[PDB]
Amino acid sequence: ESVVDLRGMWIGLVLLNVFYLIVRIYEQVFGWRAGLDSFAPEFQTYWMSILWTEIPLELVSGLGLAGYLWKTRDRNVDAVTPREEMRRLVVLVQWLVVYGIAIYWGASFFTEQDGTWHMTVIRDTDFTPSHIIEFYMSYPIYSVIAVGAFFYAKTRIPYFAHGYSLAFLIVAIGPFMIIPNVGLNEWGHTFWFMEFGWMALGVFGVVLQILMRIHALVGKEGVKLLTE
């Protein structure tokens, strides 16, 4: 048919940068004067609403994508043909470029956005307009694509099925060990008196593992010969 598809990839990116862009604007508009005092009721309509929605929604979203992929897993994986595997990989590489973007928004944009909002309020609880997005939105999402990628690979590629790449295992799991970091880092002084770094570039190993599988599914012919 063809190996490279990309149709899938674009739907993710397009659907994402949009949702975040809506959000950045929604927070531009209701951040300023609707989310400045939590004891007001327009906070409940414009922020405390989003919170109460996303969490349950994300939580289901995640277990959704999980069950589906497992359910639609290729029960006879080892049989997979050299073209179909190569195709599958290219979809895997796709999941990772969406994971990529999800990582950007969650972990850079909405994370260092929080920094500036700490210079703007005095905080009515730990639920700011910035936290609703950073913690209970942009992170959960990015974590869910993470799990998606993990599960897709596991149920489509013979290598990631019968295994667990420790690399991918890390990538899929350390998002649940950022809250211990980025979160509690904030309750520094309050949680203090009673008293280097563990990170997720596990993607290195994961793309390296992918790379090895490509180098495999091209004969001596394509390999040496076509690309000297």
Ligand X SMILES: C[As](C)(=O)[O-]
Residues in contact with Zn ion by CB under 5 A are: 78, 114, 162, 186
Nearest-approach distance from CB 71 to ligand X, in angstroms: 14
Q: After which residues is the chain broken (C to N over 2.5 A)?
A: 195
What is the 8-class DSSP label of residue 179?
I
- Residue 101 found at the interface with other proteins (CB under 8 A): yes
- Our CB check for Zn ion shows the closer of 201 and 216 to be 216
Among 65, 66, 161, 173, binds ligand X (CB under 6 A): 161
- Single-letter amino acid, residue 194: M
Among 50, 77, 132, 210, binds ligand X (CB under 6 A): 77
Q: How far apart are CA 9 and CA 1, in angstroms?
A: 18
What is the 8-class DSSP label of residue 223?
I
- Residue 61 found at the interface with other proteins (CB under 8 A): no
Helix (H, G, I), strand (E, B) or coil at 34: coil
Give the chain's end-to-end CA distance (angstroms, integer). Answer: 27
- Residue 164 found at the interface with other proteins (CB under 8 A): yes
What is the 8-class DSSP label of residue 33?
T
- Residue 41 found at the interface with other proteins (CB under 8 A): no
Q: Chain centroid to CA 107: how far?
A: 9
- Residue 70 found at the interface with other proteins (CB under 8 A): no
- Residue 80 found at the interface with ligand X (CB under 6 A): no
Classify 200 in phi/psi space as left (phi over 0), alpha (psi -120 to 50) or beta.
beta
Q: Which of residues 170-199 bind other proteins (CB under 8 A)?
A: 173, 176-185, 187, 189-191, 193-194, 196-197, 199
- Residue 7 found at the interface with other proteins (CB under 8 A): no
Interface residues with ligand X (CB under 6 A) are 77-78, 161-162
